[PDB]
């Protein structure tokens, strides 16, 4: 385990790698909002269908 950990290690500050979480969340928020609007449109279509009958 330690062998692979040292082999795949990069010389760089650690506080910068963890900072990538902010970028990952900012990039996933777009897909999250897309899924939100998609499910909202789906629910609207479902309620319209139930109203038409």
């Amino acid at each position: 385990d330690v062998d692979t950990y040292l082999s795949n290690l990069q010389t760089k500050t650690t506080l910068s790698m963890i900072a990538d979480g902010l970028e990952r969340s900012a990039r996933d928020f777009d897909a999250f909002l897309e899924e939100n609007v998609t499910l909202e449109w789906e629910a609207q279509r479902k309620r319209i269908y139930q109203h038409f009958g």
Partner: protein, 1641 residues
């Protein structure tokens, strides 16, 4: 029950390093420097408080005695030990010491191998670097030098190792002697006003060792007076070893160097023993000593020839002179001439001890010893021989008058009948004042000035015997200039003008000075005579007044003696002028006295000094005058007359040049003493003003004494300084000293004169101070000028620094020009000092120290603040910076060679226990050099300097500073600070490899030396310094040094080994050092995680438990409880701990082992929930109150003017933002800063700084907790411990939203919080919604968000766009979570009514950045219109949605991302039936058919994957937004709008063709379903009427075949381009297909 548990700890600790032996080297330094921290440390406290150490120091003969300790040695050496045992056995066999002492010395040498190796000659690389830096400075030996490999291979040899062990043994003996001497000195003559801890330790040591209790009226002096023989007997063995080296020692080691070292060590031990004996004797001055010991000591001295046999060599003169002086001192002490003569004449017993006068054998021995000493021809026996001659003369006089036991002595040696021998001895001693000269030399070597060989108290107590001898030899010896000069050189000791301080000391030290006024003899023989012989004999009276004023500054009982003697002089004495022969007449009263009285009205200096007629006088054969006057006024008048270049034949003679210099010097000293005593409590603030007014009395009204000094300077500087005699240079130095003195009470006139002094870059007139440069010889006559000028300049700069105020007659421009001239002069002096040849090194050392201190005070004062207060010296600071950072390539080395030479001389200087003045001067010089280097480094780092040519030289200077600490431990913290500054400069600028300049062996030695963070003492300042140095070295690109410091060559004895030991005891360790330890840990983790985290996981059982303990018992609000300043420290420690835990959890998650650790740590977030994201502890009320109180009392100076310029690392204490170190002296000039009972502005400023540090620590903890919770949200993905997690997240979000509304912090001090703490809650809510674990409690969470949105000033398009965007995303996620959950409609309609509409209108008006904001607003509205509570409030929200008429602006913006967003906005608006029909009204079709987009729509280029961007954009806008809107508007009413949709379809068939042709053997399936529904509804409508729906323009067969052929191969053309962060679409596809089948089939 007195063991060596603490004296000689177990060998296991000494080898492993867990407890370094408190060797005498460290103890001697602590007792010599009188350091508070070291002397009050736990280790040294326990070491000294032990009874074993007391018994050892009370019997040093036992420490190194020969005895059979084989049992103890074998028991200690049992339970690299073989080599230690072999070395100990060899040393015990060679020297007669015991085996335990040999083992201890060997262990100490083993622990101190780093120093022994660093004090060795440098390698060839260092020599080459020094030769390259040099381009004087040749004191190093470059010829003799070898490489590092050959030096290390020879270091590990056997002969060299044994030689070093013997050298360390001698050094430890010297250190033990010096330490016991300093301990006895501090215990007997302890100074007052010391720290309570020091007094407590002193009393404890006394009560434990000698039972000397101060509370007892009569302490037990027995154990204190019994220490004299203990050392007088050891002196025998000392001289025996000096005259004969060990016989069993190998002959190969008995070399010239070893013999010289042994001789020097023996001389030092003898000197220390003599000093301890003198102290034990003078402890009881009035009583006599036991004659049984004095007889033995005199016999030993007679046998040894007063140590002249061992001191006869010419190579130990430096150590022989002080040895002889101390021998003479102890001899005169034991003789006790003062009490001896009293006992002889008065015949009164002392009642304290039997004197040696009752034993004729002792007298015979003393006489024969003195005779042998005088016959041998030695100068050391001069004072002792003179004292013995006086004693014998007094005894003979007493015998003749009587003509008891002394008669036997007088008769046995034939001296009864004749007095020839003692008479001849006295004659040959007094001839040419040889005795007086040797006594003056001894006093100089036993004085208080820096030239003395011992401490100030040692010399003060040693001068007592000489003063008593002169007192008892004053009555017999007539008054003469020789004894007067002798007493002057003894008392004053040629002290410097700046060697006078108001530091209160014990009465013992001041006894030597008060004796002059206490005893009637020294008062009526020297004081009265010196006063009478004035100004005739000006030097004696001047030196007497000077020393008395310097000594009686704090003595309030005799503080007005000098002033009285100067203002009311009783008599006058001046030379007689032949012109006055006709202005006097003899009264014929007494011919022997030669009395007379003035007959004419003599007018001197013809208000003015006038003498009345009828004054009596005495001709001393010059004449004495008995008239009361103020000698100060007459001296000032004489100085004025001499400076005016006017001579009066009918007046008194002018003062001599030397006399004028001494007069000005004594005046300056008196003025300085007055100014120093006036500031002290109990004095008068008008002392210096009154003194100056009296000095300027009966003088010309136009000028004063300052003008006299100005004229004298102008006269002396008229010609070039090169052609000036010694007396003139001394007069100039005295004038500079007087200007320095007057600078305190009258800065205005001093500055006004310096503005036109014409001495420092004044004009082109010859006489400038910069013309004294070159390759000249600066002897004592020429050195006293610059040594005073530099200090005068430093004082001028210090006075100018106080620009917040006496100053009548000055201006900003004048002070700026004077400061620039002073800086130019100082720079010229610093550049020229590299060529002068001084008689000694101490002069150049003091000069370098002074100039470096001046430059440092100039540099720091410029960048310490950024307000206008530091503008007076700003030009000088800028000039100095531009000259010391970017000098020309021709004169670059001239400014660097001085520092290199200083470092060389400091690192090549031999360590000696004597001459403490020179030692402290060199230490202060090194400290100033290092501070100036650090200031230059920080200045280069600031202002954005990309090319620093000084770094190339600072590297080679650090090459020497790596070894310099080996000579003195005091250089540890300053050198480490300089290295830290250099590393910081190299960081913000790979850098030059420091290992190439240091060297492998040297670097390893430095690392092994600095790995111990003040182990023997354990102080906080040096500990924090070392931790910051380590952190800075690790943060930089340094890799080799970082590895050698961390690994130690895992780690076994490296820095981390002790860092963990300190971290596992933070519950009791000082919080101040804990911050630095945690900073070092973080700096080693972030850059070297693979090692630190590994070692911590391997030993986490000791760190995780302590972290949990700290977290659980860490209250939130610590200010209310006991402790105010510790709150910031605790917050910083918690922030560092949280950051370290976050990094550890991140590494574990990267290794997939962060589950159990995170689950165990989440239960320790109590302190976080308490005092984490909440930053409301700013307390702006008290800050505003302090600001108002400071602006009301200081209209000119503001509170913000004290803001730091980021020049130094802002300490997290009472000086984080406000500069307190400078304010203490800048505002402490008027009442208001001090305050009663520790009140005023100082305490409020300290509280404000503590609050700012606490806020900074809270922000750091906020960032740490943000990272921790961000990583935990991903780590804690499964369904477990969800309740506590959700509670913590909600509490954090609520605290953040509340802090956003409560009072905000300032933007100029701290960073703007806007957008800094919003994304935190944003991502928290995002992840919690992704997990779907919310309690749908938005009923109250949305109130804070709404209040914030209302009180944000609506920055929709202002510069603060990120804050608006993050607030919009936060409210979006909040309303989405609310939708998942009525009492919510009335709370949520506020955003739909006032927020969304206002923001949309503002965006539409601004757009006339915008795309993303409009899309976010559209998404917000879409997600808000889905709340269940709105499905019933449609009728209620219709009015508030139609009041703004957003449809008009939407359609306007639609008439191309803006059009798409407007279309989506109107679509989401049409989600309601009322709005649906409103939009379906004819208002839509108009613009829908008239929109300009029809131009592109009609074109056949439309398509989903069309190469043209516009075509694809239009296709997407039509497919994703137009069809749902069509379905919505149709749901309301279809029968009426069927013609419209039919026309829209048959008018643009290209879209239908593209939709039905693209799919061949998703958002398009929605289109198919919409078309199917439209076909169904239009057919149902046409079933009744035929006028509408003329053509369906839709095929069913093709669509049927398509849906049949499309119901694994489906993934052929499924490549989602938008969603790429998340089975997904097949479910929706099958649902849409089922819907199509249901509507069509």
């Amino acid at each position: 029950t007195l063991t060596d548990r603490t004296y000689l700890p177990p060998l296991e600790d000494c080898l492993t390093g867990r407890t370094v032996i408190l060797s005498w080297r460290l103890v001697a330094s602590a007792l010599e420097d009188a350091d508070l921290a070291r002397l009050t440390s736990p280790a040294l406290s326990t070491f000294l408080r032990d009874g074993f150490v007391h018994e050892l120091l009370k019997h040093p003969a036992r420490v190194f005695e020969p005895k059979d300790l084989k049992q103890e040695f074998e028991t200690k050496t049992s339970s690299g030990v073989d080599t230690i045992k072999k070395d100990a056995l060899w040393l015990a066999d060679a020297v007669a010491i015991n085996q335990v002492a040999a083992l201890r010395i060997v262990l100490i040498e083993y622990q101190t191998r780093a120093h022994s190796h660093l004090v060795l000659p440098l390698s060839t690389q260092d020599v080459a670097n020094i030769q390259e830096a040099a381009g004087i400075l040749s004191l190093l030996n470059p010829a003799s030098a070898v490489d590092a490999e050959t030096m290390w291979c020879d270091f590990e040899t056997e002969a060299r190792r044994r030689e070093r062990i013997l050298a360390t043994y001698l050094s430890e003996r010297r250190s033990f002697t010096a330490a016991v001497d300093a301990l006895v000195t501090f215990l007997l003559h302890s100074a007052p006003g010391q720290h309570k801890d020091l007094d407590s330790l002193r009393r404890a040591l006394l009560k434990d060792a000698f039972a000397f209790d101060e509370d007892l009226d009569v302490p037990d002096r027995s154990k204190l007076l019994t220490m004299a023989p203990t050392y007088m007997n050891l002196v025998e063995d000392c001289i025996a070893r000096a005259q004969a080296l060990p016989a069993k020692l190998g002959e190969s080691f008995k070399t010239e160097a070893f013999e010289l070292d042994w001789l020097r060590t023996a001389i030092t031990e003898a000197v220390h023993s003599l000093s301890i004996a003198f102290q034990a004797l003078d402890l009881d001055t009035p009583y006599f000593a036991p004659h049984e010991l004095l007889s033995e000591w005199f016999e030993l001295m007679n046998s040894s020839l007063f140590l002249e046999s061992i001191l006869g060599f010419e190579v130990v003169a430096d150590l022989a002179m002080p040895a002889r002086s101390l021998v003479s001192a102890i001899c005169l002490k034991m003789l006790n001439i003062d009490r001896t003569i009293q006992f002889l004449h008065d015949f009164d017993y002392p009642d304290g001890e039997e004197p040696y006068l009752l034993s004729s054998q002792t007298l015979n021995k003393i006489h024969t010893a003195v005779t042998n000493a005088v016959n041998s021809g030695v100068a050391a026996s001069l004072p002792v021989a003179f004292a013995w001659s006086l004693i014998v003369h007094q005894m003979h006089l007493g015998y003749q008058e009587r003509a008891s036991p002394y008669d036997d002595f007088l008769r046995e040696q034939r001296l009864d009948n004749d007095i020839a021998p003692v008479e001849q001895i006295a004659m040959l001693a007094t001839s040419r004042g040889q005795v007086y000269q040797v006594m003056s030399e001894m006093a100089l070597c036993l004085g208080t000035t820096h030239e003395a060989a011992f401490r100030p108290a040692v010399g003060a107590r040693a001068r007592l015997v000489f003063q008593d001898l002169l007192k008892r030899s004053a009555y017999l010896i007539p008054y003469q200039d020789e004894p007067v000069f002798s007493l002057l050189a003894i008392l004053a000791t040629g002290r410097q003008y700046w060697d006078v301080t108001d530091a209160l000391s014990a009465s013992s030290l001041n006894q030597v000075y008060t004796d002059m006024l206490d005893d009637e003899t020294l008062f009526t023989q020297f004081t009265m005579q010196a006063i009478n012989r004035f100004p005739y004999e000006f030097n004696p009276f001047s030196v007497l007044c000077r020393v008395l004023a310097a000594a009686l500054i704090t003595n309030k009982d005799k503080a007005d003696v000098v002033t009285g003697w100067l203002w009311r002089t009783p008599t006058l004495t001046v030379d007689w002028n032949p012109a006055w022969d006709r202005s006097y007449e003899l009264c014929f009263e007494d011919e022997n006295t030669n009395s007379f009285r003035l007959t004419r009205d003599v007018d001197l200096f013809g208000e003015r000094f006038i003498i009345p007629e009828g004054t009596l006088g005495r001709f001393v054969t010059t004449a004495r005058l008995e008239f009361e006057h103020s000698a100060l006024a007459l001296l000032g008048k004489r100085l004025e007359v001499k400076a005016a270049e006017e001579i009066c034949d009918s007046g008194m003679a002018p003062l001599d040049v030397d006399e004028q210099a001494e007069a000005v010097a004594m005046l300056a000293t008196v003025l300085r003493a007055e100014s120093l005593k006036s500031t002290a409590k109990g004095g008068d603030p008008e002392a210096p003003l009154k003194f100056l007014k009296e000095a300027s009395r009966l003088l010309p009204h136009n000028k004063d004494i300052l003008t006299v000094i100005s004229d004298t300077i102008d006269g002396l500087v008229e010609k070039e300084l090169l052609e000036l005699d010694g007396p003139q240079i001394a007069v100039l130095a005295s004038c500079l000293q007087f200007l320095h003195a007057a600078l305190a009470v009258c800065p205005g006139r001093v500055w006004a004169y310096m503005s036109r002094c014409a001495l420092i870059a004044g004009d082109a007139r010859p006489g400038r101070l910069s013309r004294i440069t070159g390759s000249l010889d600066m002897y004592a006559e020429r050195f006293d000028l610059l040594s005073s000028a530099v200090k005068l300049f430093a004082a001028l700069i210090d006075s100018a620094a106080c620009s917040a105020v006496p100053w009548l007659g000055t201006s900003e421009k004048i002070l700026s020009r004077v400061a620039l001239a002073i800086a130019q002069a100082a720079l010229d002096v610093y550049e020229s000092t590299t060529t002068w040849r001084f008689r000694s090194e101490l002069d150049r050392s003091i000069l370098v120290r002074d100039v470096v201190g001046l430059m440092h005070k100039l540099v720091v004062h410029a960048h310490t603040l950024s307000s206008h207060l530091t503008s007076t010296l700003s030009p000088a600071a800028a000039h100095i910076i531009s000259s010391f950072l970017t000098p020309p390539p021709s004169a670059s080395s001239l400014r660097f060679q001085p520092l290199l030479g200083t470092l060389l001389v400091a690192l090549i200087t031999p360590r000696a226990t004597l001459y403490p003045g020179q030692s402290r001067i060199l230490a202060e010089r090194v400290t100033s050099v290092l501070a100036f280097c650090t200031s230059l480094l920080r200045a280069a780092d600031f202002l954005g300097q990309t090319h620093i040519p000084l770094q190339t030289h600072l590297f080679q200077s650090a090459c020497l500073l790596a070894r310099l600490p080996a000579a003195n431990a005091v250089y540890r913290a300053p050198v480490l600070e300089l290295l830290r500054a250099l590393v910081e400069v190299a960081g913000r600028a790979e850098p030059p490899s420091l290992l190439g300049y240091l060297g492998s062996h040297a670097a390893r030695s430095f690392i092994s030396l600095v790995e111990g963070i003040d182990k023997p003492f354990g102080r906080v300042e040096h500990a924090v310094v070392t931790w910051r140095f380590f952190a800075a070295v690790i943060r930089n690109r340094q890799q080799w040094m970082a590895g050698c410091l961390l690994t130690g060559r895992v780690g076994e004895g490296s820095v981390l080994a002790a860092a963990m030991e300190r971290l596992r005891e933070v519950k009791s360790l000082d919080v101040q050092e804990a911050v630095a330890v945690m900073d070092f840990v973080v700096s080693a983790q972030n850059y070297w995680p693979w090692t630190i985290f590994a070692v911590r996981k391997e030993k986490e059982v000791v760190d995780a438990l302590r972290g949990y303990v700290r977290g659980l018992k860490a209250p939130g609000m610590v200010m209310k409880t006991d402790g105010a300043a510790a709150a910031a420290f605790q917050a910083r420690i918690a922030a560092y701990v949280a950051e370290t835990f976050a990094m550890q959890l991140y590494h574990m998650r990267q290794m997939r082992q962060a589950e159990k650790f995170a689950g165990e740590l989440v239960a320790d977030l109590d302190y976080f929930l308490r005092e984490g994201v909440m930053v409301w502890g700013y307390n702006a009320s008290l800050h505003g109150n302090f600001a108002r109180n400071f602006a009301k009392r200081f209209p000119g100076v503001e509170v913000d003017d004290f803001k730091r310029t980021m020049w130094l690392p802002r300490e997290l204490g009472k000086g984080y933002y406000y500069a307190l170190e400078v304010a203490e002296q800048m505002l402490g000039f008027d009442a208001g800063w001090g305050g009663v009972k520790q009140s005023g502005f100082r305490k409020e400023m300290e509280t404000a700084n503590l609050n700012l540090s606490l806020v900074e620590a809270q922000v750091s903890l906020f960032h740490a907790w943000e990272y921790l919770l961000l990583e935990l949200t991903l780590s804690l993905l499964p369904k477990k411990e969800n309740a506590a997690f959700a509670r913590q997240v909600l509490q954090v979000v609520e605290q953040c939203l509340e802090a956003n509304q409560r009072s905000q912090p300032p933007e100029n001090i701290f960073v703007v919080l806007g957008h800094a703490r919003a994304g935190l809650a944003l991502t928290l809510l995002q992840r919690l919604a992704d997990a779907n674990q919310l309690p749908r409690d938005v009923t109250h969470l949305l109130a804070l968000v709404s209040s914030a949105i209302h009180a944000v000033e609506n920055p929709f398009g202002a510069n603060d766009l990120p804050y608006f965007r993050t607030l919009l995303k936060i409210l979006f996620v909040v309303l989405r979570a609310a939708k998942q959950g009525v009492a919510i409609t009335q709370q949520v309609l506020t955003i739909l009514d006032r927020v969304v509409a206002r923001c949309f209108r503002a965006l539409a008006a601004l757009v006339h950045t915008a795309p993303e904001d409009l899309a976010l607003i559209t998404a917000i509205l879409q997600a808000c219109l889905s709340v269940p509570g709105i499905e019933q409030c449609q009728v209620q929200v219709l009015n508030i949605m139609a009041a703004h008429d957003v449809f008009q602006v939407a359609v306007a913006l639609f008439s191309p991302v803006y059009g798409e967003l407007a279309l989506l906005f109107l679509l989401e608006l049409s989600a309601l039936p009322a709005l649906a029909e409103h939009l379906a009204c004819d208002g839509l079709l108009g613009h829908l058919a008239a929109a300009r987009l029809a131009g592109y729509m009609r074109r056949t280029n439309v398509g989903p994957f069309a190469e043209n961007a516009g075509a694809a954009r239009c296709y997407a806008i039509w497919a994703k937004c137009l069809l749902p809107l069509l379905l919505n508007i149709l749901a309301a009413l279809g029968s009426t709008v069927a013609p419209e949709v039919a026309w829209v379809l048959n008018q643009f068939p290209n879209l239908l063709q593209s939709s039905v042709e693209r799919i061949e053997p998703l958002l398009e399936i929605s289109e198919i379903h919409s078309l199917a529904l439209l076909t169904r509804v239009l057919a149902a409508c046409r079933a009744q009427n035929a006028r509408d729906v003329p053509e369906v323009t839709w095929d069913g067969a093709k669509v049927l075949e398509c849906v049949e052929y499309w119901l694994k191969v489906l993934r052929e053309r499924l490549v989602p381009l938008g969603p790429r962060e998340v089975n997904r679409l097949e479910e929706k596809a099958v649902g849409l297909l089922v819907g199509v089948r249901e509507v069509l089939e």
